[model samples]
Target: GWEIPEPYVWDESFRVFYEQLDEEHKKIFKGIFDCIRDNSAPNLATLVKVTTNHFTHEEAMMDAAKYSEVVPHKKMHKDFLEKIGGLSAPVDAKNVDYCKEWNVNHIKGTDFKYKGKL
Candidate 1:
């Protein structure tokens, strides 16, 4: 079984260099880390609520920019919600790495396309 780091840290490689998204990413990471590390319930709710708002913010921006791939990008967020949605309070490692990986992969693979449009 894969183990989560004792003290989870967001490495610099995940930084998008965009202030808004960077902050949101950090907040999301912190929420996830604290939830897992402490087995806290509030952080899980924090993650979901903030993630929804963050996604809405991005969608509005993307809509304004007339992004070509906005459709798929929205779906990406939807699929993420599916992963996030499947979880209950006191989530364990089995459901976490995929999300951790998804955040980094999404930032690098997808968000990179709109890095400058903001």
Candidate 2:
């Protein structure tokens, strides 16, 4: 698979800013990206775990305070998990390309918008 290099970086100076906004986005993205880059399963459980662990109603409420699209964005994540998790046998459901494509699209479309507003 082809790797589309990520241009975003979280430098030391931006640590405070990132933490303040509860923007651990880069870490999760990097984990998913690295799993695909290494030709691994990209663990569905990790996706579920992170989504549940990080995104609280309070946090999302804060995001919704800024981006009116936050509700839809959260729903998109829920929908993606449902779709991806439902793959049956013989599907090679763990394909790295699938993870790569989903991650790239999710970041570029959803997360990019969040960053722009913040």
Candidate 3:
């Protein structure tokens, strides 16, 4: 839903920087990818924490400590956690789509901007 042609398009140097950052960013992605790739039902809360912690770490790592965007980004993560954490198995087990979509798109869209000295 946050789709926009990247605004950072003019800077190739930054693009490379972003790519390397993306590689580092994938470190956060590994666990969920493993769980999903292997089809494990790790509890919803734990998964939410991982996602929260991952974005927190990403912000710090990107040295975007002063960036105003962190607030909304964190809020977004929290909102997802609150929503998913309340669900019963019958409601949630079928919503692996949440995990897959968030994980994939965060890497693709969220990480892209912070990948460099923007």
Candidate 4:
């Protein structure tokens, strides 16, 4: 597919920092961007694992900080993971967009909601 060439933006321009968790998010993007340049189905599928771990870190941190929104936020993370689990891929563009767009929306939208709370 022609869309294969466009990697997700991984520069500082593409991110917002809420905490060190953002670093974990960036690692996820690295997997995404790297996979865009190749055709590794296994790596692409394992990409979900990076996201899974990051979300785990988030929940643990949220709990440590006693973030009141943790419940809903946990749901948000769960929903995204479920979507990732459903991906059917030879590293399709939609697989890439689902993770890329959701991360942007998540960090800008839902992620900021916990600012200073955690």
Each prediction's total of clashing residue pairs, residues at least 3 apart in sequence or on different chains, is 0, 0, 0, 0
| Candidate lDDT values, in order | 0.74, 0.52, 0.50, 0.73
Q: Which stretches of candidate 1 lie over 4 Å from their true place?
A: 1-7
Q: For candidate 2, lDDT tens digit of each residue in 27-79?
A: 55654554444533445455545545545542464475677777777777777
* lDDT of each residue in 19-64, candidate 4, tens digit only: 4687887787777776767647676676778889989998998899
What is the C-alpha lDDT profile of model 3 across 74-108, one tens digit per residue? 67666766765665433344466565566556655
Off by over 4 Å in 4: 1-7, 13-19
Better lDDT candidate (3, 4): 4
Using lDDT as the measure, the top candidate is: 1
lDDT for 65 in candidate 2 is 62
- The C-alpha local distance difference test score for the whole of candidate 1 amounts to 0.74
Ranking by TM-score: 1, 4, 2, 3
Task: Report RMSD (Å) for each prediction in the order shown.
Answer: 3.2, 5.6, 7.1, 4.3
Error of 4 at 23 (Å): 1.8
Comparing 1 and 4 on lDDT, the stronger one: 1
Q: What lDDT score goes with residue 11 in model 1? A: 63
